[PDB]
Symmetry: D3
Subunit: 291 residues, 6 copies
């Protein structure tokens, strides 16, 4: 039972995704293709990264992540295929996913295949890796790749060979670390007792607000649950709430909750109401926090 | 081949759903996860109800409906898991789904697992139930549920245990009826020969308009096909048309059809054109019909 | 493990699709359903055709394409079921899809099932057909089809019987060619050295612009890679770029690329930026190319 | 203290209008300039005509109407200057305007000055004219008119000379009737008892709906106050109300009133609420009335 | 030199206003018509009131305010004409308007003429009045008023007779106080040290935010300039700033200023930036303040 | 008959402007107040400059230009009052405004009064100045200026004193040149034969596009009428057209005209259609022209 978990920016409006899916079933008859999502902001590798980094602990070992936004499509660049190290505990407290105590996932048990454009930055940082390869072998990519559709040609297709048991180290030469392109994570700065970060995303469809201010960033300025926090978005909209586990802790429908999202990050929202949408709060706006 | 049919408000923009799907495949290797939809109006239990109520007759016996919007996530609340009684004929005339005479579905053959927040109201109304359970066992929910992601923790995960043959009655104690939270259906009033109801939905992507005025509500005011109806949306926009089986019965492209939707309810549309969109007609307006 | 590739206009907002999916699994237990996409512009047969015509080469032989937009739902019209001839090479160069030299696909290896409203126009013209049939048998459609939901009753349901091995020629009587409804493809005109066509689509979610000016139309005005082209949308926005394989060939981010899309068509876009969205360029504007 | 009543499409966003105003005061020191409005849809002569045709009765005799939208600016075309015949009674009943029995206005008492593009169509047809002239004299237009600003140069400037007592017949040679450009008024058709017309305008800022169905058109289908009318916009929105003098006659706030607007035309609206705005009703939709 | 100051909801899109203006110059040849504004929210008497209440001290004595929104147009209701008592000091500090020490304005020196619908509520409250009259005399209103245009017929027209020296007390019988319709001012409540009020308007075109929390409301909870204030709009967006005279006091471009607007009311804004528009802050949203 | 020509960003939605106008009539009974416009982009000094610079040649000698956006309101800053030198020919060829040969305007005949924030930059550039003064005297500004309404207090009021014959040099001390705040004009660069500039404005309500590429900038690259120009907005949308006097020169409705606007600058539009609006072209984009 092989599984390819598919993430791209191909959208949900035409047959793009299906074409990849057609190819995946054609290469690996028994595959289950799990859509991650296909609707990220085109070419936004940083956004992409957020969608792919938290996956491994949820999927059965041997799962293959075909993760792609490919602005460099049709160029000589080639995909990188890495087998990640730890599945890594994640979440508001840092645990294994699943029922009971969660499902402990053995190391070396997932492979990502992605453009070598930085998409895998956070994956590599949070999970580490055992081995990394340039996807150049004509046994796993087309001999005449479609100039514009490298998401299909240099990702989908070879994700399928990988799902189908094609040995990882045969896709092309090993890549040294400096050859795996990285992007720079926007850093969280401890100026004063405060923590400056950014709204790193809007949590659709609810309009919850997500900052890049991680738990660890918080537990080092003191801040843990119960703590009365002042959170300031866009530099002008301040907000006050205690840090709480969840939304209903805010009290009435509409009230502000400051909480840690399911990825471990300081977030803000309204209890059973959208905070972002009425106020057009958006990704890229700054975000300060202090108790 | 166990099937989990998945309905949520998780959206289609991040890895939320896939996280759930990963866990599903991990708990129940053989599962086929069928998306119902994941783009309901967040926290709108009434809306969600409408997407899950008519499913059972279309799915193979033994299907599990993982259905969730969970405003109460992170609280002490626990999901309910019911096995429904009748699959229940549905539709504009009330029939079994499928080719020929349709496929009759044995009683007691589907289980719903949902927040105990009322999402299951109309399900229980239309289908009745054999047994209902508080989803509390550590064998089918996390010991450390992610505060904010109870859709994953108290729904996805346990739906997978259930698909996997985990005995329903072992998820937690039996729930008495009064403990199964219900919402109140907004009622249709026979004031005069008229029927006041409500636009209960816009039928996306077509812009057809659906009222909570069910057939039985109509065949007790007399009205059946052929009948010349006056329908009045928002209290201001009147409409005249015979009740007809379908859209093309309206005649020319753009003409008004008053008809009965595939769920059995009084609806209005334009023949091969959108009624709702040019006029900004919404889920929530007043609907009124007369002869 | 046969496969139904499903394309419709039913949207991703309600349980419509899943109802069809439910029936599919019910009729053909072992089916894998592949979503093509379900968010075509309602009733736009020409658009739908675009989404279905290039699929055969991608899917394993025996794949069944349930392709539907059905404004004539509820009428006496009956769907057509064709087995296509050639899987037909496609793309910017005209190749088999897949790794290596691609996967050659035997003829007579795919069935399309659709409303007889013209959706399969391009299919039939680019792939040809071996045999065509009116879908009338009670063995594959309901005895009381839901008047408004012929996508489900006259497509999904029977697509499932055909996936399940139901002999194609037993769905209903053979249709003669003139009975397969055709729409008229907007033609490309060689007025001068120029080539007048149309923006056939906006390529979502990137905002690339696609014309109905096919490569063949190009290679007979001389035009091939390297050529400096003037492309003029809407009649007033001219555009100058050499015809190149891909986006990055435009140079800096934002630069215009004139290139052939993955379907073989002349297209225009910006390198890692949206061309269509900032300027509200929309399908249907004139499009012209010349040396 | 003579008066130039000024109507144009120059907008209220730049100094365009004021430039004309500046010239007006410069040419006719004692002028009072009355803004009619300057935010007509650019180049829409039919709309402009609506704004200028009913003014004469309101202004003191000798008033000069500088009325302009000039797409032909910078060309050899020259404005027409007419002295109108009748000030012409107007309104829902047909009366002189003002207190008491209103202010009867002598004939031959107002001059219009406009592009010879058809703007004065309705003017000439409802008021008649005594004398018409091509505005060609260097005594009233520039010797080097600004190519793009013929509203200023071929209207405002000369309107000022005429306000200042410049003899009308010395602006340029007389024009014969056939040389005064006319546009064709969309006609109201008595098909049955019904009356087919058009939504001629949206009455901003209220959202009332105005048809080109004049009272006279009404009083010959029988229709006068008290009559129960069916009015049908866009072909599908029917509407039922008695024809009444005013809005409050509809009863409660929000209720539909069918009434005659202040220009004599059949109109529809909501009592102290907008009819057109919530439903995006727009000028140009069909409009029909009957008993 | 008589002046009529004109305020209505007639908009700036057609000849409505001009028709009134035509009539005004016709009744009172020497009048100067000063537009106040014509773009208030139709029928919003409370909004209207805010536009008319602060005027008297700016205009030369004898000025006449023609102030109208007239939902009751065409009914038997009649306008009220009042001569107000004091011109009343206004502003952030409460002073006479003008150069030097300002222009002291004698009592009994302004008349308002308005629908008797409550438009004059705040005028009457802030300025008091000497005498009040029903405008019924056929010497100052038409004998056949246009049903729909009472703004013109029962306001403009008789504002002009009043400007023209027609004795106030001749317009119709005196009205006792209980006959002058009043609306209820939304009250500011001292719950705790805090002051609950409302955003009473958005200050266009800047997007400054205006509350109904008057200076006096502030100087009674202590609050005066310098004071560190917490201001909470919509119940969720808190804000902190010192109360300062003006915008630049906020410091950097973009910073929040809490200040008293030119009408005396607690306001909030961004220094040289819009506060309302990016966040879609709107009239009707609550507004708390506390130091 | 003294004229105050008024330009501000006060908008047209409240009584702001009228407050100013009231004071104007109160200080200078005989004044005619001419609105320039009041809807400029708040605080956008560059924009405002463009609305006030070309006025003088259109107004009678002695006219006073009250021109204001005042971000610094409430601060110690004080307005500047200058008497300009030349009225300065303007336009697409450079002429006096008016009928015949136009009306020559004597030097030293207009005064501008404005915030000393740079609003007057291009005025002083194009017109030069004879004398400049700090507006400080209590005789022409309030002793207690309203902190927030310096447009009224330090502009409207004193413009009225000036219209009223109050000696310019008595408003406050003479200002040396370096004390008259200037902004920097964004410059046009002759890189190659090309001219890079900027869309300096959208010409509302037509959607014509105005560049800061002045005629003289063009007649030194050679370019005069007849010349075939390539113009490139936003760096992406190219355009080809002869330089022509006017719009109709483009030929058919909708065709592109490249021409020189009434202020002398290079502009682009569609003949009797909007260029800017369908394409969302904005004040601020890059403009580039070549041959
Ligand atoms: N106009 C474009 N500029 C830059 N990159 C683009 C463009 N269009 C598509 N892409 C990329 C992203 C897809 O994942 C990928 C599919 O191979 O193609
Ligand atoms: N702002 C919110 N307030 C209250 N509850 C919220 C909020 N956002 C998401 N949720 C809930 C509902 C999801 O279905 C559910 C999935 O765990 O999470
Ligand atoms: N308003 C309408 N007029 C005509 N046809 C409509 C309408 N809405 C849906 N449809 C059709 C097309 C879907 O594919 C189809 C699903 O069976 O339903
Ligand atoms: N793009 C354009 N095409 C054709 N005509 C236009 C355009 N813009 C303005 N106008 C005209 C009409 C104004 O009344 C007039 C003012 O003289 O300028
Ligand atoms: N549809 C309407 N419902 C209620 N009131 C309306 C409507 N249209 C106009 N008005 C009012 C307000 C104007 O000031 C006034 C002009 O006399 O007419
Ligand atoms: N938010 C603001 N920040 C800074 N200044 C502002 C603001 N709003 C108005 N103004 C100024 C500019 C007006 O022209 C001027 C009229 O007094 O008031
Ligand atoms: C708490 S909402 C559950 C889905 C959400 N997007 C998340 O990952 O946390
Ligand atoms: C153009 S890159 C992404 C694939 C594209 N939507 C296609 O159909 O080719
Ligand atoms: C309809 S009430 C306001 C006047 C309206 N705009 C008219 O033209 O009559
Ligand atoms: C401070 S902005 C000046 C105009 C504003 N609308 C007011 O009355 O205060
Ligand atoms: Cl991040
Ligand atoms: Cl108020």
């Amino acid at each position: 039972r092989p599984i390819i978990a598919f993430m791209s920016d191909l959208g949900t409006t035409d047959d793009s995704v299906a074409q990849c899916k057609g190819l995946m079933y054609s290469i690996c008859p028994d595959v289950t293709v799990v859509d991650v999502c296909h609707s990220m902001t085109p070419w936004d590798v940083e956004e992409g990264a957020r969608y792919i980094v938290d996956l491994p602990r949820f999927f059965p070992e041997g799962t293959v992540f075909a993760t792609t936004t490919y602005p460099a499509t049709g160029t000589t660049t080639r995909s990188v295929a890495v087998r990640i190290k730890q599945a890594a505990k994640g979440g508001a407290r840092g645990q294994w996913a699943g029922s009971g105590a969660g499902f402990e996932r053995a190391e070396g048990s997932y492979i990502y295949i992605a453009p070598n454009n930085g998409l895998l930055t956070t994956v590599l940082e949070e999970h580490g890796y055992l081995e990394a390869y340039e996807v150049t072998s004509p046994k796993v990519i087309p001999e005449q790749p479609e100039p514009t559709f490298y998401s299909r040609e240099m990702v989908a297709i070879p994700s399928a060979h990988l799902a189908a048991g094609f040995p990882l180290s045969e896709v092309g030469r090993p890549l040294e670390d400096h050859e795996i392109v990285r992007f720079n994570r926007p850093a969280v700065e401890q100026d004063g007792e405060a923590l400056v970060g950014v709204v790193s995303a809007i949590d659709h469809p609810f309009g919850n607000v997500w900052t890049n201010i991680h738990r660890t960033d918080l537990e080092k300025a003191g801040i843990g649950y119960g703590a009365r926090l002042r959170l300031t978005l866009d530099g002008v909209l301040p907000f006050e709430a205690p840090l709480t586990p969840t939304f209903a802790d805010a009290g009435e429908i509409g009230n502000i909750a400051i909480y840690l999202n399911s990825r471990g990050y300081l977030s803000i929202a309204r209890n059973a109401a959208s905070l972002a949408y009425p106020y057009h709060l958006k990704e890229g706006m700054s975000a300060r926090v202090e108790a």
